[PDB]
Design a protein around this ligand. Sequence first.
Ligand SMILES: Nc1ncnc2c1ncn2[C@@H]1O[C@H](COP(=O)(O)OP(=O)(O)NP(=O)(O)O)[C@@H](O)[C@H]1O
Ligand SMILES: Nc1ncnc2c1ncn2[C@@H]1O[C@H](COP(=O)(O)OP(=O)(O)NP(=O)(O)O)[C@@H](O)[C@H]1O
Ligand SMILES: Nc1ncnc2c1ncn2[C@@H]1O[C@H](COP(=O)(O)OP(=O)(O)NP(=O)(O)O)[C@@H](O)[C@H]1O
Lengths: 620, 811
Amino acid sequence: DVLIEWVAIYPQIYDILEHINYVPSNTLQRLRLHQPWSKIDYDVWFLYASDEIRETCKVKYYGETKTYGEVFVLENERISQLHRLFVSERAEHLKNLLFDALPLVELGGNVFFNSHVPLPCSLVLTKSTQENLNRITPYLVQKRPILLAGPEGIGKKFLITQIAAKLGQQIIRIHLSDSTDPKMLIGTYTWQPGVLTQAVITGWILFTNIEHEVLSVLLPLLEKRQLVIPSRGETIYAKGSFQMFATSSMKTKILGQRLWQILDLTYQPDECVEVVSTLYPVLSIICPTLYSVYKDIFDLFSSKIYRRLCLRDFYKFIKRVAFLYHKVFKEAIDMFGAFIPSRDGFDLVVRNVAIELNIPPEKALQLPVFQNLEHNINIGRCSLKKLSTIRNSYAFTSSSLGLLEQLAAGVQTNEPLLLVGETGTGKTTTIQLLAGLLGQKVTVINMSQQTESSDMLGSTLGLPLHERFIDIFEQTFSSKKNAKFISMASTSARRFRWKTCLKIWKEACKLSKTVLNQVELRNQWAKFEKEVEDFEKVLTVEGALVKAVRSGHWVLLDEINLASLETLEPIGQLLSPHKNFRLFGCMNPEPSFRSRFTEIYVHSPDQNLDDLLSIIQKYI
Amino acid sequence: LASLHAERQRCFAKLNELAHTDTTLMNASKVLRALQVLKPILLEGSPGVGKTSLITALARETGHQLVRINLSDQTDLMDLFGSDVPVEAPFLAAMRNGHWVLLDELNLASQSVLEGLNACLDHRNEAYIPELDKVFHPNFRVFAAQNPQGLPRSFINRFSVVYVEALKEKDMIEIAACNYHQVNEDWRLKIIKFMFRLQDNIEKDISGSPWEFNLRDTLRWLQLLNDAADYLEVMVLHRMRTVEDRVRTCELFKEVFDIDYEPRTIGFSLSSQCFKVGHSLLVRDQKTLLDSQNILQSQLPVLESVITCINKKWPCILVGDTATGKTCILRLLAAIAGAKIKEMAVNSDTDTMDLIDISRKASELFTDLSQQLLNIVIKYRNFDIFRETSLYTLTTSQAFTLLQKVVDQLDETLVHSLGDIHEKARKLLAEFSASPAGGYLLKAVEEGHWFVLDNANLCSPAVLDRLNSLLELIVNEKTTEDGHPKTIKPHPNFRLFLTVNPVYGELSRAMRNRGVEIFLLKEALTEIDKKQMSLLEPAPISSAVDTLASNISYIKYVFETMGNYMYIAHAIILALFSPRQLKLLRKVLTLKNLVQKIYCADYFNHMDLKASRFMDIYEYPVQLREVVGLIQTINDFQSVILTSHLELPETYASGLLFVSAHEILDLTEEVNTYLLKSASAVYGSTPSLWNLLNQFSKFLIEIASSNIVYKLDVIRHFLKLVVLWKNIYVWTSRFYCYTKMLGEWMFTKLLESFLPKDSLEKFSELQTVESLRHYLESLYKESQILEIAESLNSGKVNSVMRRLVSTEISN
Ligand SMILES: Nc1ncnc2c1ncn2[C@@H]1O[C@H](COP(=O)(O)OP(=O)(O)NP(=O)(O)O)[C@@H](O)[C@H]1O
Ligand SMILES: Nc1ncnc2c1ncn2[C@@H]1O[C@H](COP(=O)(O)OP(=O)(O)NP(=O)(O)O)[C@@H](O)[C@H]1O
Ligand SMILES: Nc1ncnc2c1ncn2[C@@H]1O[C@H](COP(=O)(O)OP(=O)(O)NP(=O)(O)O)[C@@H](O)[C@H]1O
């Protein structure tokens, strides 16, 4: 009712309460209906014209007094005094006071009312994240398109994810890329459902890797909540909660004008409480002692630091320590510096760790085959309940035992893993330990040639068919010596120059029409002609990782150290539905892909001066 | 450079050591020299021309037909030899009948059609390999449009290349002679020499862009002149983006045209039937957009320069720099005009086919039904009945409910005019259970909307080339049937408005050379920044796109922007507000309260026959249709009142004379301590001052209300006495000297000093220069008030009022 009095005073909370249930009136439909796109048809006095029609129509009861039309000037200061008064917090208290005629009034940093549902609501904090949620309550109430450009690894995608969890909203997170077609934008033909069009249809939404022309294909949504559906021919009223939040840490796009940018910031040592929040039985500051161990690892790095210890890295260390803590854990952080190409540097990491830990167990520093029956893996303080057992050369040297135990520890944790070396046999160890555990399927995508789309996602076919059928019908209708060069130019133009042959179809169709056992061939020439016309109007897949993640193979992405910016694969890693995948990639010696995969270097498993006797035995 | 011309002489030196238009005739003489040897003739010329230099010469050539073979991408060799018919042609006819075969755009060919043209170029009858063995008229010389460079070094070394040069300057005057009807001919030679030396000086220094400055712009300025030297400078140097280069261009304009390019201040007159700014009106007639961006008064210096470009049917190019506000310029322009803005973001590597399945037509039908019902209910507001339910359905395949729509189209003459489109499209929509077969600008080029090719810096050269084919209208599509082009000539209200930015690459030199380039920048003036960012503050200045609101808005502003005083105040205030605003201020009835007395006295006598001088004075010069702006009219003839006529300025001072006169006269009716003694002694004894005041004030009110009073710069001298009578009624012993001063301002027509002669001779029958003090005080304080009002006029600190009172302050 009259609370549209304060309609645009606060943000569209009142407009959302109207979108629950509201109707018009004279001054009401004068007021609220002025939005950026509609069609009025109730009082189109306002939009019909600005001549004495609109310059002289009427306005009913403007301050409950009936001026004429230009009581906009009565109102476009009256609302502006309210817009000044709302600069003086308890603004949401005034909005909840103003709702005095009990819906799903969500609080938050400021307020919301998205009457959909609650959610699981995992990622909580009371930290610099609380100031970030303070900095993003405002525009998310105001429903402009937002962004976020803090430094890397603040969990900004997780920030938006848990923010949507505070809402009743499901953040479909399209990682748009520099090879994107308009398909997941809208679809295609030659009429598809579309993905971005689906979220616009159903109603928040999140995009990533926006920084690296199809931005303009979304700029129609950013100017107003509607899209350019070119084929179906209808802009979509996006009448829900379609807040198209994005993420990138730069500023170079049109959203730099269009979207209300915002700057997140994270005090990293509050991670100490966070994992304390996250892992309940890690309430000891042995956790924070491991954070200090990460600091000491940074101080040892600062032979060549090709890695950067991060809060993601410390969270993964908390993950592997949590995998431990069901059952000391010197071996755990000993794995957490295994990406160290000098074994002396590994020893120095071990000394730093033992400084953070208790007394020197170098016994553990150079420490098994299997217990391989039904949960058929037990290699090295780590087991694997293998599935549907199938199985060449097996159980090699102590270095092979170490790499297999490391890959076991990775596989139990559902993390990413690589192995840089020089042999081309870390893949052999990978497929070996795959089958020796079970063997899911070694989807060994050599990702160095098919550059970026063919891993991720995804035409003279009818031309030879119609060349055959037109050769047959010109054999039926015309004659050998008669249409001879016409046949020869139906031939020479058919050898993959497949658009001038439309003329050789059409003119032969014309003479076949002029040729009018008989009517069957008549319909044959006619249907051939109509099909040729459909082709001559037409003349003017399944990704391997997707098949894996739906299937259950092992994604052995080899040779990532010679690839391109195929960082959509890192986005698909950052997605983690699944049961048990295996993204055991294989490098061969990237500042953020190679900083997001828990790597384990190889140590050239051939060198123990009698271990080659083992492989020599298995070979000979 | 042109020194090669000199070096040509040097070349001619080595030659001598070895020993229709004018320039167009030299180029045609070159082509005549070229035809003397049997080969293809290539036009190796700089861009902008086109093959007109050979499109015309055929008419002066022995009946030689013009085979304009527009060789393009989709062009097979079978589309150039043909004849392949199942037994039971322009290039071909040109091989058959002898003709001039103009091969347009050889560089855009498929490189076997290139091989076919390589085959055909023999002197002897051709023996083609690629389709047939050979296709033998024996004079069929084929001319070659060597396009903007690509061509193969064998195809481009078997032909013969002719160097098409540019236009000579006296020859450019000859080309201007088709425009010199409404042109001062020496001013025409000045504009031509100005563009020539402008390009010749701009191509030698820092100023960034290619800076084309071509003869099409010269003819554009010449044909701009014929619809009345300021507007030429405005829309031929608003398109220099860096302000230092604008200063240098103004200096070159002074070097050539010999004037001072002081910027003519523009102003937003926004009445009902017309909204206008600064030597540019707009047919503000039915309004589609219903926008949400405001007037942006600081953009008023360039919002005019496209509005003129919106009226001259030139190619609108809101070029320039990012986030400065460019979509809002065209948005506001065609928002107030109502020209149905519709935009296409041509930077997505879009294609030429992108500019030029049952449910799609069903939705378009629902939308157009809603549009026609809207325009119906605009005029004859009588309809309701499920017709309103038909409208609600219209804004709502399984489209069987659309058949219900036709039932509503089933159940008068206005209904007949709606159902003309509606029942026809719905009877076609009865076929919504049948067989299917499933443009952008061709919608707007056939409708009346205004098209906005937004962000259109980087799409393609050739897409804008097929656009520039329609830039100069008839459009040749290819979605037509068999053999007919069917160009749509509905261009009336169809304007190509192209945004750009400088971030990507600039628009190509062809579309730069065939458009009206208009930069934009950032200023943020005072009321401008007040109104743009007004979401905190209480008020904009021009707070609508409807004039009855904008009137009360600006009248609430400048009657609140007001902060021997109130004379020049009340005068300038009732001098800057509009006459419609004057009626409105009277309708809306400290100093503003007393202004209602000035309103009653102005509607009595503001401009009784002063408006007759203004009408007749205004009438001789080109003038608007109505009475919307006044001080902007005073500012608007800024070259004319720089002609020393002062037709508009003298009216401005006459207003001050009338208001000051009313002040002096009410003071004198109050006259009806020593002056108090004399005025009492109308009824100390023997007065001499009271008559000396009352007769001169009668002379004042005589000078207020009468034909020669309209015919009265001398009004400033009378106002000197007005300040003098003020200063004596303040300066009311010294009667002798004060009378001698009044006698001087009389010594500065009969009656208006005759009354001073009577009162002075009476006071002399009874019987320092500080009048300059409060005089120059009044001059300075009115100069201050002039600036404070010229703020709310435009927002730059200068005016014809200001320059006038400044030259008065020289005295
Ligand atoms: N308030 C929080 N509550 C719980 N976990 C948090 C919180 N803040 C951060 N984290 C964790 O911090 C990690 C951030 O890494 P992650 O989001 O996986 O990659 P990323 O940081 O988003 N890459 P980027 O999107 O560029 O920041 C996540 O694993 C979160 O669990
Ligand atoms: N888990 C394991 N069990 C048994 N043998 C293993 C295991 N892991 C590695 N090996 C051995 O490690 C070696 C891997 O070498 P391999 O990569 O096959 O040679 P290669 O030179 O790369 N083949 P090629 O491509 O022709 O050059 C083989 O001798 C394997 O038997
Ligand atoms: N009348 C106006 N009302 C409000 N804002 C305006 C107005 N005129 C200009 N602006 C400013 O200009 C913006 C809108 O135009 P704008 O978004 O800059 O088009 P654009 O982004 O410049 N297109 P481009 O040239 O590619 O940058 C607003 O956000 C303001 O910064």
